[PDB]
Design a protein around this ligand. Sequence first.
Ligand SMILES: COc1cc2ccc(=O)oc2cc1O
Ligand SMILES: [Ca+2]
Ligand SMILES: [Ca+2]
Lengths: 409, 426
Amino acid sequence: DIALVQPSHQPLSNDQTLSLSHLDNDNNLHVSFRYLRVYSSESPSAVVSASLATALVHYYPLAGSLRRSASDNRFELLCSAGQSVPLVNAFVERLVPDPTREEGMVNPCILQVTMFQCGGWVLGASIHHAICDGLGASLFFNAMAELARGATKISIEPVWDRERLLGPREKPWVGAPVRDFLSLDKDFDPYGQAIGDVKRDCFFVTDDSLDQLKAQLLEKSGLNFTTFEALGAYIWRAKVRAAKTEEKENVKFVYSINIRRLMNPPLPKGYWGNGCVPMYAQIKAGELIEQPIWKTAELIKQSKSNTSDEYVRSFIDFQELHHKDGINAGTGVTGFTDWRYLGHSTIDFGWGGPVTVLPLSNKLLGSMEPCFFLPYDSGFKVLVNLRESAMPEFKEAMDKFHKGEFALS
Amino acid sequence: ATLEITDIALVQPSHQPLSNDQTLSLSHLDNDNNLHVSFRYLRVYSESPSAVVSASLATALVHYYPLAGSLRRSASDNRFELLCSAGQSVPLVNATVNCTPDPGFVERLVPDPTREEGMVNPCILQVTMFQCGGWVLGASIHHAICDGLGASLFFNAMAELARGATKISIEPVWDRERLLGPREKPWVGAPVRDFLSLDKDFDPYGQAIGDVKRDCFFVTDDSLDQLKAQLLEKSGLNFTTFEALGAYIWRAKVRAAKTEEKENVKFVYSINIRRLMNPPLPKGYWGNGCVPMYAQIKAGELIEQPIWKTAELIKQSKSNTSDEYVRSFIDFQELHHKDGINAGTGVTGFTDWRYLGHSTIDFGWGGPVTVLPLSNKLLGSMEPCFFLPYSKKDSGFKVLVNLRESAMPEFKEAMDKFHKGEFALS
Ligand SMILES: COc1cc2ccc(=O)oc2cc1O
Ligand SMILES: [Ca+2]
Ligand SMILES: [Ca+2]
């Protein structure tokens, strides 16, 4: 059973093509991001279709179709009256739609509500990553949630204005910290690498294992690292090691940061497009599998150095210059995404906050083996997508961690 | 920069006091639309604070378990009710930092829920640990749950338990719909009718005034004494610092805002009505126990009338403080909750913090060396101002003003003339 939800009240009089920002049109984001929310305890089917319909008054672009435009290969978003977001009513893979490129450009936002008699239900979503980032999506979902809870109007009104706020410079200019991560190769597909079948697996990590880990890196290097730095170091090393990567292959650690607060001037509060740029560390595989973790952890710590206004403006301008030319960060890229402490909590439709949340996409940040830190004696889940050949050695690495045999050099 | 979040503890009551669910109704003061906001403040100080606050919290939650609960709109009337259930928790964000006061950094010290998101988690604490046995306690409480004094009952109860107390010394009183209920034949007097108005389409906190900046001003006990002595010389009346300086700030801010000459502007503050009701509210009552008082004038009059007149207007506003004023305000809410009760545009809220009991919130590390409010939405104002407590010539307090970005240059100039004692009294 699949309901085609249109806006409650119709906002568009005549058609409307919006362009997307230079961050939106990054080739790494030509993918459908797939995730699901679980909840316990009018039915959730009905409650989310009503939220959806009223939020679509303000978020009507999600209803729209992406296409390529003949002048360049950039996406623009066609919006027209009659457009609708599909709501599917209803192993884990069947819980959120898996649209192919065409279906994903045709329906860049697709929701699914699976109820089963065991109280709970699941909300699945398949949003094309060019439309928006995780903060953007979460503006959209908190807006639906708040409307479900009886809100009078949406509390933050969404801002488009994308080609204006995140456009290129009239005289484009790209700095060394962008040029040194990236390369041009029209013939390279970050997501088409022959690495065998990619598995998904989950590992619990205890707040106490991490504190052990930081205390020892501190004793041996006099720096305190963040969980992200220390644990990311450890997972990166373990991954590259298990993939038996050739010693002189350049490997990379990539993560996404929110730049909204950091621009001059800051981005609007209502801004729901892509408002993240990828940050990197790179090193030879051999150096990584054999240097101490404190060095690798330090290398990641130093990468947020490049978090600045100019770094973002460089990245955009690089895309102006080379969109048609195959921009990529090459092979050996591992993506990492921190999810531990977003506000999952407030996407409350009536049934409380989601008891667990789960990303299914394994193509992200120009990686095929992206890793995610998922929300909460105490500890959190680490999800790793890793090629099948590497996964047994990797399980053993996480089991050594679990037992605090960290192998620090 | 580099503030981590080490973890988020979901603290439950020590012992769980509900068997199954429980909806509590809130008072018609609690459900005032101007209170549908989060109040955000932090306390600065110099087993760990993290562990000691979580254990206090857990044992207070035996008596204060509604802080754990979720605000929803009722199926009958669209007022907030508070759903309480076993499982429910107060979030404690534990976080750490080193390294270089900075405006939008201080924002990270306490969570920043939107009004609607704040209903899901109406009570959020944050313990940010710092170098050399120093830390910050941040709090984001939905204003419908409780007021200043109410929170302060809750925090002193945590603190006394931290100091080794056998039990909490005052049992909190709910009983809200009964003690602050409306009259069987609601009746609303002209002192309330004249401040408030009805517009379902009006958002006190959604007006288009631009970005709102926050800035702090030191004001010397000596500048104020010059200020009172001169108002006295020129009118023979004695004004409090709240009257004289409030006058001055209000005029300077309306003037800086270039406000149209026949706009009605207002000066609003909140007063504790606990001791004033008949009968009084019980001591353990921790909901909202305050009503706003106002003074109003056309903007043109305020920017050009002498200060002593404006200070007089504010001194005369506490006239309206009575039992009946409260019962009028409540009954106006009974009548017109559904119809958009508001005090309109041009309201500047003021809050005096100089003589409350900050210092008994003592967890182990003494009382807080300084305290700081972050919310800029309060009293139906988008530009609230706060007088902050004390730690001859150098002695004084900080005045914190939330003012739209376009007006803040002219306002700085105004406080600089004050600092130098160029008061321009007419
Ligand atoms: C207890 O948390 C609060 C603290 C204060 C303090 C001053 C004020 O203006 O209002 C408050 C509302 C609150 O919910
Ligand atoms: Ca390069
Ligand atoms: Ca009126």
